[PDB]
Ligand binder design. Sequence first.
Ligand SMILES: *[C@@H]1O[C@H](CO)[C@@H](O[C@@H]2O[C@H](CO)[C@@H](O[C@@H]3O[C@H](CO[C@H]4O[C@H](CO)[C@@H](O)[C@H](O)[C@@H]4O[C@@H]4O[C@H](CO)[C@@H](O[C@H]5O[C@H](CO[C@]6(C(=O)O)C[C@H](O)[C@@H](NC(C)=O)[C@H]([C@H](O)[C@H](O)CO)O6)[C@H](O)[C@H](O)[C@H]5O)[C@H](O)[C@H]4NC(C)=O)[C@@H](O)[C@H](O[C@H]4O[C@H](CO)[C@@H](O)[C@H](O)[C@@H]4O[C@@H]4O[C@H](CO)[C@@H](O[C@@H]5O[C@H](CO[C@]6(C(=O)O)C[C@H](O)[C@@H](NC(C)=O)[C@H]([C@H](O)[C@H](O)CO)O6)[C@H](O)[C@H](O)[C@H]5O)[C@H](O)[C@H]4NC(C)=O)[C@@H]3O)[C@H](O)[C@H]2NC(C)=O)[C@H](O)[C@H]1NC(C)=O
Ligand SMILES: *[C@@H]1O[C@H](CO)[C@@H](O[C@@H]2O[C@H](CO)[C@@H](O)[C@H](O)[C@H]2NC(C)=O)[C@H](O)[C@H]1NC(C)=O
Ligand SMILES: O=C(O)[C@H]1CCCN1C(=O)CCCCC(=O)N1CCC[C@@H]1C(=O)O
Ligand SMILES: O=C(O)[C@H]1CCCN1C(=O)CCCCC(=O)N1CCC[C@@H]1C(=O)O
Ligand SMILES: O=C(O)[C@H]1CCCN1C(=O)CCCCC(=O)N1CCC[C@@H]1C(=O)O
Ligand SMILES: O=C(O)[C@H]1CCCN1C(=O)CCCCC(=O)N1CCC[C@@H]1C(=O)O
Ligand SMILES: O=C(O)[C@H]1CCCN1C(=O)CCCCC(=O)N1CCC[C@@H]1C(=O)O
Ligand SMILES: *[C@@H]1O[C@H](CO)[C@@H](O)[C@H](O)[C@H]1NC(C)=O
Ligand SMILES: *[C@@H]1O[C@H](CO)[C@@H](O)[C@H](O)[C@H]1NC(C)=O
Ligand SMILES: *[C@@H]1O[C@H](CO)[C@@H](O)[C@H](O)[C@H]1NC(C)=O
Lengths: 204, 204, 204, 204, 204
Amino acid sequence: HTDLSGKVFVFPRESVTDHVNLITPLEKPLQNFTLCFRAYSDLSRAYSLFSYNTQGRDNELLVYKERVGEYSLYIGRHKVTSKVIEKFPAPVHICVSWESSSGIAEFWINGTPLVKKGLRQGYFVEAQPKIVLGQEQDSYGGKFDRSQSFVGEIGDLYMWDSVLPPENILSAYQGTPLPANILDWQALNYEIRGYVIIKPLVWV
Amino acid sequence: HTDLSGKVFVFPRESVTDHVNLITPLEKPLQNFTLCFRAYSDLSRAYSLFSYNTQGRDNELLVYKERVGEYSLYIGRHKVTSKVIEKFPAPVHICVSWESSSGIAEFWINGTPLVKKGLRQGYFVEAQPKIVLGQEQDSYGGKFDRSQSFVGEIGDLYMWDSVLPPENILSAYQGTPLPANILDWQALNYEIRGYVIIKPLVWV
Amino acid sequence: HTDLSGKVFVFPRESVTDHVNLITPLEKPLQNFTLCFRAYSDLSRAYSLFSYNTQGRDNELLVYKERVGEYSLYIGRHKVTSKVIEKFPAPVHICVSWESSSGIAEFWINGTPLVKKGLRQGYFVEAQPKIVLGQEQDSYGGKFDRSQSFVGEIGDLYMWDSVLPPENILSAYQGTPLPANILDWQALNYEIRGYVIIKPLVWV
Amino acid sequence: HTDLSGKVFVFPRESVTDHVNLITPLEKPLQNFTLCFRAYSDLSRAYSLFSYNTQGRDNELLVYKERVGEYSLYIGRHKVTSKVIEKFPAPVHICVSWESSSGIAEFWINGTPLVKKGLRQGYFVEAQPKIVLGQEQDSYGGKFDRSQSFVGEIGDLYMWDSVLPPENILSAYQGTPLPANILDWQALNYEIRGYVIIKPLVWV
Amino acid sequence: HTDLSGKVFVFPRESVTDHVNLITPLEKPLQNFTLCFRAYSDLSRAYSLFSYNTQGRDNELLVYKERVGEYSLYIGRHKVTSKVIEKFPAPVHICVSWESSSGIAEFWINGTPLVKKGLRQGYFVEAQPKIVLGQEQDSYGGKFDRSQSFVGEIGDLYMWDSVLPPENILSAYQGTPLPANILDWQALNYEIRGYVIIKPLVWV
Ligand SMILES: *[C@@H]1O[C@H](CO)[C@@H](O[C@@H]2O[C@H](CO)[C@@H](O[C@@H]3O[C@H](CO[C@H]4O[C@H](CO)[C@@H](O)[C@H](O)[C@@H]4O[C@@H]4O[C@H](CO)[C@@H](O[C@H]5O[C@H](CO[C@]6(C(=O)O)C[C@H](O)[C@@H](NC(C)=O)[C@H]([C@H](O)[C@H](O)CO)O6)[C@H](O)[C@H](O)[C@H]5O)[C@H](O)[C@H]4NC(C)=O)[C@@H](O)[C@H](O[C@H]4O[C@H](CO)[C@@H](O)[C@H](O)[C@@H]4O[C@@H]4O[C@H](CO)[C@@H](O[C@@H]5O[C@H](CO[C@]6(C(=O)O)C[C@H](O)[C@@H](NC(C)=O)[C@H]([C@H](O)[C@H](O)CO)O6)[C@H](O)[C@H](O)[C@H]5O)[C@H](O)[C@H]4NC(C)=O)[C@@H]3O)[C@H](O)[C@H]2NC(C)=O)[C@H](O)[C@H]1NC(C)=O
Ligand SMILES: *[C@@H]1O[C@H](CO)[C@@H](O[C@@H]2O[C@H](CO)[C@@H](O)[C@H](O)[C@H]2NC(C)=O)[C@H](O)[C@H]1NC(C)=O
Ligand SMILES: O=C(O)[C@H]1CCCN1C(=O)CCCCC(=O)N1CCC[C@@H]1C(=O)O
Ligand SMILES: O=C(O)[C@H]1CCCN1C(=O)CCCCC(=O)N1CCC[C@@H]1C(=O)O
Ligand SMILES: O=C(O)[C@H]1CCCN1C(=O)CCCCC(=O)N1CCC[C@@H]1C(=O)O
Ligand SMILES: O=C(O)[C@H]1CCCN1C(=O)CCCCC(=O)N1CCC[C@@H]1C(=O)O
Ligand SMILES: O=C(O)[C@H]1CCCN1C(=O)CCCCC(=O)N1CCC[C@@H]1C(=O)O
Ligand SMILES: *[C@@H]1O[C@H](CO)[C@@H](O)[C@H](O)[C@H]1NC(C)=O
Ligand SMILES: *[C@@H]1O[C@H](CO)[C@@H](O)[C@H](O)[C@H]1NC(C)=O
Ligand SMILES: *[C@@H]1O[C@H](CO)[C@@H](O)[C@H](O)[C@H]1NC(C)=O
């Protein structure tokens, strides 16, 4: 694994091929999770931030930016959407959690909680995923779409198999995240495919 | 009866069936009242915040958000509306009072008094209500309308059979409400129907 | 008379009949005057703030809000209009003075002087007026127009038979007006006609 | 001469006749100058601020406001224009300088330098002007145009036969102008024609 | 060489001829560079800020302002574009760096980093350039276009044959740049062609 503290992936151009694969040994279906990361893009079209597909299942867990001020989460191909006041262009810190028992999904944008939504109560997110940054998967690992590609910078990505309490979400926003057991930016296993460059983070 | 201090009802999806019934023993018609609560929604269409119907009488006491910055109160099916500068989306704290003797209705939004309006001077709000959060009633307890449903979070709801002076309204807004004899968040008798989840309040 | 310190007139609904008559001991034509008051309304259409008519003479002295940010003064049926940056809805403190010798009219909005205009140099405003709040007169005392009615709250009204220097205007704005010899809120003679309610001032 | 310290000319109405003539025994052609003054108008159409014509020469030196945020200088009938962020309506302090040697024209608006422009390098502004406030001259002293008339207040007008450095512009802006040898508000020779009233300056 | 500390080039008018040539002894192809300068213009159409062409190669290194809030860099006739929130008109400090090994291009606008883009990975910028301010070259030293001309002021220009770290970019922004080996405002070799005037910098 590699410690990417203080660094970002730069997806420096639009394409249907540039991407990063994130590797996790996740074998157990997820009942709960929290996912946090920081991103900086000047795209105004929609784009995928985090794409997690499993065999036979598109949009099994997907974080997708619809337009300025509007974020969607998909769980098992069902979607919820939440709104927020934001500037454009601007760096953003995004957390999202989901809890099967209640179905509640919660976005936090720059440490501010969005209105809670709910979906897929009782569902388990399937395991053995392919996880992709920079492109949105329609297949198990592929079938990308140029108009959903992420162009810009991503970093500080963590994913936990629990629902973090607010204090721990704020800690992540402030730059001291709890160590994470699904994905952890400070101990990350990844594969760059195509034109993706690792650079220091200069915009926090 | 349940103490919901520090908690909210989450109506996590749009529907024509998800709702909470609030039970009060109120039997004497009301000359005066004050109603306070906090809400957080990213709907921009109109929606009902607090729906109180009596037998044979639609919109007997209704707090209805027309659009961003515009709030209506119905008394006995007659309406007044007042405007305020506000951000969107954003949590809101709302108090509203009405006094039969003068007919005066006063909204307070995030501690700001709106322009006073007046209606139903001399009227008495009927008692033995059905009170619903999450949907707007057109019947005694039912006949909901998807396009009036409330999607989002509501908490800290109190209702008194008198007009609170401004200092007591600010106390509610600050988080130190007087005890309340019609509805009280710290001793609430409620019935969840459909998809409504109780969660901690994280947005005040 | 009546001491309305700390209180406002509330015109709680649109109508063509609700109004207040103000009674002045004014037997002499006016060469100079200053008029100050506070108002709070969420109307965006035009409306009359202060209507003073004499026999055979419509708009003999009239303060009329044309639209957000635009105020007009009529003297002997002639009009001037001045603009200002303001928020909507918002309480406002308005002073207006006029003097025959120069014809100069000056509005002050929330203690800010508007651009001076001029009209009716050499003219004397006629005596023996009917003075009305809540409606715009077209006759001596009447002939109202619903689309010119004032809905909202008015308080702290004073009128002097001289042109106040700026430091006295600012004293009025801050809540310490000099004693006033035409109309005085602390010693006011008035009649309520229709639906007008007196309430405490809560927005200053 | 007259000392107008603390006072303004008020042009209280739109007309094609109201104006002030400024008198200066300017007998030698001008190679360099700076002109400063304060103005307050809520016109949104174009208008002349300072009109200097010589025999057979229209727009020999003219300061003209095109629209909110846009100011023009004419030298010998040729024009430059520069833009600025400004509020409307609002008082403004305006300085403009021009230098034959380089042709450079500087506007300063509320103490802020606009982008430099250039025109008429090597030219001499003709002597023996008629100088008018309130109207734009097309002839030697006349041929006004109602739609270019200045309605509002003008004060603190100074004109120097040199290009003032920045600190001298700050000095004028803050109400402490350097002594001036072409026109000086504290020793001004002027002629009022029509409806122009001298009043105290209350908006600084 | 000339020390232009505290001075700017003023391009006082639109034209297809006014320009400055910048002379550098650059003989080896450039792998990496940083370019910083300050500019002030009230043009809203597109314009060239810095035009570097080599024999037979248009837009070999070009910094081009597309519209308010949008900056482009060309390397070997390929383009990237980044967006920023900015006021108009307003002075600006611009740095841009590019590195062949990664292809990464980074704009800094008033010390704020824009989203990184990438182009021309592995390419070397050709040497023996003609470098022009005030006009956009389509040939080696010429073939200008009036609608791409720069009207306004430019100063404090430095170019280095390395990618400056962030703290050094802030140094340049604040007025204490590192000495620079390709172009240096304190030791600049330049030629004025047409109407370009050197004046003190008054807008920092
Ligand atoms: C909801 O809410 C509501 C509201 O809030 C409520 O209600 C309320 O309530 C409350 C409580 O209850 C109340 O209070 C009260 O008050 C009162 C007053 O009133 C008033 O005010 C108020 C205020 O707010 C109000 O509200 C009311 O309403 C009123 O007001 C008014 O109204 C009216 C109507 O009616 C109106 O009308 C008028 O006016 C009009 C108009 O005007 C005008 C105009 O505008 O325009 C003006 C102007 O200037 C003019 N101008 C010229 C130029 O002129 C004009 C003209 O004129 C025309 O226009 C033409 O041109 O005009 C007209 O004017 C007409 O005409 C008139 O009429 C009016 O306006 C109004 N005003 C105002 C100001 O606004 C009071 O009074 C009361 O009192 C009390 O107080 C306290 C508190 O502070 C209490 O607590 C208590 O009660 C008290 O006390 C007392 O004392 C007394 C005395 O001092 C007494 O008496 C005594 O007694 C004694 C003893 O006894 C004996 C005998 O008998 O003798 C002894 C022996 O020994 C023994 N024996 C043995 C063997 O032992 C015996 C035995 O015991 C016995 O008998 C028994 O059996 O005893 C002796 O007698 C001695 O002598 C005496 O003195 C008493 O008793 C006591 N009491 C008690 C109980 O204690 C109170 O305060 C209120 O009122 C109400 N309100 C209503 C509305 O309702 C409710 O409640 C709620 N709900 C629920 C359910 O909760
Ligand atoms: C341009 O920058 C590149 C990248 O920083 C420089 O290449 C590096 O050179 C150093 C030592 O000279 C090595 O440690 C790196 O591994 C090199 N990186 C790569 C990708 O080649 C390069 O030297 C710079 N060029 C010039 C002319 O200074
Ligand atoms: O791409 C996805 O998997 C989902 C998740 C993000 C948004 N999205 C969709 O909008 C579903 C469809 C994406 C592709 C698309 O826009 N179209 C339009 C017609 C053909 C094709 C399709 O739906 O299959
Ligand atoms: O729903 C209510 O009881 C009141 C209170 C909130 C707003 N409202 C209304 O707008 C009244 C009518 C709502 C339903 C509606 O829009 N229509 C349109 C035609 C049929 C139906 C109706 O009025 O019955
Ligand atoms: O009402 C007044 O006395 C004055 C003062 C306020 C504006 N106004 C006007 O006259 C403006 C026009 C308002 C509408 C109106 O009164 N109309 C429109 C046509 C018939 C009737 C009229 O002018 O008599
Ligand atoms: O009035 C001036 O001397 C100059 C200076 C300010 C603007 N202007 C212009 O000439 C602009 C055009 C204004 C309108 C005008 O004067 N017109 C319009 C056509 C006939 C007449 C003319 O140019 O002579
Ligand atoms: O001028 C350049 O070299 C490049 C760099 C800056 C922007 N630009 C262009 O937009 C290329 C086109 C410039 C000239 C132009 O707009 N046209 C339009 C048709 C003919 C002519 C051309 O492309 O040759
Ligand atoms: C999911 O998180 C919540 C929080 O307590 C709870 O429903 C459950 O225990 C968690 N599930 C698992 C399997 O860890
Ligand atoms: C009005 O003010 C003028 C100008 O100062 C003054 O001459 C006159 O006395 C005033 N009128 C009255 C009635 O006092
Ligand atoms: C105008 O300024 C120029 C350039 O600074 C100077 O040389 C000239 O003497 C000035 N003209 C006069 C008449 O003062």
